[PDB]
């Protein structure tokens, strides 16, 4: 299914994903299009920060949902 | 009367309200339809964040007005 990931700068990333994809998998798909490593990616949906262990289905993320991507600096 | 609340996900929520409803009442009605706790709701109308102890009438929110909902983490 298709989902959208919006950065805080207004840019929209389109991904192909399955309900059983984990948040980490979703982050790796963002890495394939943008180059952003999963460890710098914070995903939000409906006022909740998404956890790497959980799946899209766990969060009730359905077709054509929008996730919000927040980028973070690398500590080192 | 009917008012509308728009979320930033594109959804419109329709509520049945009266002019004497307080902002808290409105937030509780949003909780009944969406499950969002009042303490995570910020309602925006005419450039203002709406305050809990005031009524729709106080803000001149009339039939078929649209509020915008912002969610806290």
């Amino acid at each position: 299914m298709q989902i959208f990931v919006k950065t805080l700068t207004g840019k929209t990333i389109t991904l192909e994903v399955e309900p059983s994809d984990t948040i980490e998998n979703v982050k790796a798909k963002i890495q394939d299009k943008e180059g952003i490593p999963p460890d710098q990616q914070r995903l939000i949906f409906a006022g909740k920060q998404l956890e790497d262990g959980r799946t899209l289905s766990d969060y009730n993320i359905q077709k054509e949902s929008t996730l919000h991507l927040v980028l973070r600096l690398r500590g080192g | 009367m009917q008012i509308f609340v728009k979320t930033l996900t594109g959804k419109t929520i329709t509520l049945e309200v009266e002019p004497s409803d307080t902002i808290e009442n409105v937030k509780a009605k949003i909780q009944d339809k969406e499950g969002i706790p009042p303490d995570q709701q910020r309602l925006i109308f005419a450039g203002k964040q709406l305050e809990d102890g005031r009524t729709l009438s106080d803000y001149n929110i009339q039939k078929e007005s649209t509020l915008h909902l912002v969610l806290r983490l």
Partner: peptide, 19 residues
């Protein structure tokens, strides 16, 4: 106030998401 409420709401949601 036209699009004021939408554009303000979007910016605010965003501020919330940066927290």
């Amino acid at each position: 106030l036209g699009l004021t409420d939408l554009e303000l709401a979007q910016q605010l949601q965003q501020e919330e998401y940066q927290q």
